[PDB]
C-alpha cells in the first residue's frame, strides 16, 4: 500500500497550502499517515466540519491541484501575513488566493468557472474574520461583507464575525474554511462584497482504496 | 515548530570524553531517524553516524566507530553523543539531525541543531 | 567513499545576477528505487545548515522559485537565477545514496557591491 508519511503535516495543511506543507503538492496516496504533533504554522484558520473534509480528501487519496483562470477585477490578489510566513517574507496558503480591496472599494466579485471536465472537482475556499472593524473597512471597505458560493444544484452563503479571538500567531482574527464540489456540467459562481478568501482552481476528486490513519510509528 | 536544541559550546581536557545531548522536540523522535555532524573550521561536514530512536540501532561512519558512541534516552527525547579521548583534531562543531528515512518524500536532514562548539584544550 | 566535487569555490555575483555552482560525484547517485538523493544545503555564516533543494530539483519548505536544481548521474547544479542580498552564504551538496553519506566542500556565495 502505498503509504504517505505526513511528517509534521496534517491533510488538511498539504490540502489548503500551508508553507511547510507545499513539499506534499499533488502526492497521491492509499494510506496517508497523521502524526500526532504535526501542527500548523500560517494564518490561525477553523474548519466547521473538519471531520468531513478531513474524510472526503482522505477517501479522495489525492491532492493533485489543478490552477484555474480566475480573474479578479479590481481587488488586490495575494495578500500575505507575517503569521503564514513564507520565506524570509510574510505568506499565506498556497492553494488559496486573498482579495483586499482595491484604492478605496472593494467591488461586488460575482466570477463564475464552468465544469466542463467529466469529473467532479473540489473547491477549497474560505472567509476572513477582522478582529476589529477597523481592520474590516481597512482591508474590505465595505464594513460587512458576506460570502456566496454556489452552483445549479447548492448555494452557501456565509457572513463574516467581527471579533477578538485568542493571538494565534501574532493574529486574533481567523478564516473559516468551507468547500464545494462541482458536478459534470455544473457551474461555479462566486458572489460576494468583502471578506472573501478565493480559490485559485480545483483539486480532482478519485474514488478508491485511500484513507488517513494517525500514528507515530516508524514507516 | 520542530526544534533540536543543542548546547552550544563545551571545553574539554584533553584525552577526557564529552557526552553532547540534542534535545529533540515538535515532532516525536522515534518516528524518525537521527545523524550527527562534525564540522572542521575549515568547512568540512563530516557524518559521523546515525541511530534509530526507536530500536536504537546505529550505525557508524567506520572512521569514527572507536569514538562516537550514539544512544538515545525516548523518556525525554534526548538523543546524545559520546567522544572519549578527544583531541585537538575532536574540536569541532557538532549537529544532530533529523534523518527522514528513505521512507518519507525527503529522505534527507531537514532539521539541524544549533551546533555545539566542542574546544579540547587543558 | 563518493566524493562530492563543487566548484567554484568563491562565486562573487552581484545583485539580481543569476549565480550557478556545480557538484560531481565520484559514482552515480541513482538508488536501486532510480531515485536520486543528491540535495543542496546553504549555511549563512553563524548559523546551521538549511535544505534548500532535495532529490535533485525539489524546492524544500519555504525556498523560492529562484533556486533551480537539476542534473544526472554524477553531474548536478544549482542555479540562483536573480541573486538577493540574503542569498549571501556556503552552500554544499551532498549525498544520501550511499553509505558513508558525503557533503561537498562548500561553495562561498559572495555579493558584489
Known amino acids: 500500500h502505498r503509504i504517505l508519511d505526513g511528517i509534521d503535516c496534517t491533510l488538511i495543511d498539504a490540502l489548503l497550502g500551508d508553507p511547510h506543507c507545499d513539499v506534499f503538492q499533488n502526492e497521491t496516496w492509499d494510506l496517508f499517515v497523521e502524526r500526532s504533533k504535526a501542527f500548523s504554522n500560517c494564518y490561525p484558520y477553523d474548519v466547521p466540519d473538519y471531520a468531513s473534509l478531513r474524510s472526503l480528501v482522505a477517501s479522495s487519496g489525492t491532492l493533485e491541484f489543478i490552477t484555474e483562470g480566475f480573474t479578479w477585477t479590481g481587488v488586490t490578489q495575494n495578500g500575505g501575513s507575517n503569521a503564514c510566513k513564507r520565506g524570509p517574507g510574510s505568506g499565506f496558503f498556497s492553494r488559496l488566493n486573498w482579495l483586499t480591496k482595491s484604492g478605496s472599494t472593494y467591488p461586488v466579485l460575482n466570477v463564475t468557472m464552468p465544469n466542463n471536465d467529466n469529473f467532479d472537482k473540489l473547491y477549497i475556499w474560505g472567509i476572513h474574520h477582522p478582529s476589529t472593524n477597523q481592520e474590516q473597512t481597512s482591508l474590505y471597505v465595505q464594513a460587512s461583507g458576506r460570502v456566496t458560493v454556489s452552483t445549479r444544484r447548492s448555494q452557501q452563503t456565509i457572513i463574516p464575525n467581527i471579533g477578538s479571538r485568542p493571538w494565534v500567531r501574532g493574529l486574533s482574527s481567523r478564516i473559516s474554511i468551507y468547500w464545494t464540489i462541482v458536478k459534470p456540467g455544473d457551474v461555479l459562481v462566486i458572489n460576494s462584497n468583502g471578506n472573501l478568501i478565493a480559490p485559485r482552481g480545483y483539486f480532482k476528486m478519485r474514488t478508491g482504496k485511500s484513507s488517513i490513519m494517525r500514528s507515530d510509528a516508524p514507516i | 515548530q520542530v526544534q533540536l536544541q543543542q548546547p552550544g559550546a563545551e571545553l574539554v581536557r584533553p584525552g577526557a570524553s564529552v557526552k553532547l545531548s540534542c534535545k529533540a522536540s515538535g515532532y516525536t523522535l522515534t518516528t524518525y531517524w537521527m545523524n550527527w555532524f562534525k564540522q572542521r573550521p575549515d568547512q568540512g561536514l563530516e557524518w559521523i553516524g546515525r541511530?534509530?530512536?526507536?530500536?536504537?540501532?546505529?550505525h557508524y561512519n567506520q572512521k569514527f566507530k572507536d569514538k562516537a558512541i550514539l544512544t538515545v534516552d525516548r523518556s525525554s527525547s534526548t538523543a546524545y553523543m559520546q567522544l572519549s579521548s578527544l583531541t585537538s583534531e575532536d574540536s569541532a562543531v557538532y549537529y544532530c539531525?533529523?534523518?527522514?528515512?528513505?521512507?518519507?518524500?525527503?529522505?534527507?536532514?531537514?532539521?539541524w541543531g544549533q551546533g555545539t562548539s566542542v574546544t579540547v584544550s587543558s | 567513499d563518493v566524493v562530492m566535487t563543487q566548484t567554484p569555490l568563491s562565486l562573487p555575483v552581484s545583485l539580481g545576477d543569476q549565480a550557478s555552482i556545480s557538484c560531481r560525484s565520484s559514482q552515480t547517485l541513482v538508488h536501486s528505487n532510480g531515485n536520486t538523493y543528491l540535495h543542496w544545503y546553504l549555511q549563512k555564516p553563524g548559523q546551521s545548515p538549511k535544505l534548500l533543494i532535495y532529490?535533485?530539483?525539489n524546492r524544500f519548505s519555504g525556498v523560492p522559485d529562484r533556486f533551480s536544481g537539476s542534473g544526472s548521474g554524477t553531474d548536478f547544479t544549482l542555479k540562483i537565477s536573480r541573486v538577493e542580498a540574503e542569498d549571501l552564504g556556503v552552500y554544499f551538496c551532498?549525498?544520501?545514496?550511499?553509505?558513508?553519506?558525503?557533503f561537498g566542500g562548500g561553495t562561498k556565495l559572495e555579493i558584489k557591491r
Open positions: 551532498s549525498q544520501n545514496t550511499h553509505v558513508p553519506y558525503t
Open positions: 532529490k535533485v530539483s
Open positions: 539531525t533529523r534523518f527522514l528515512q528513505i521512507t518519507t518524500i525527503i529522505y534527507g536532514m531537514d532539521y
Open positions: 541511530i534509530d530512536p526507536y530500536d536504537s540501532e546505529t
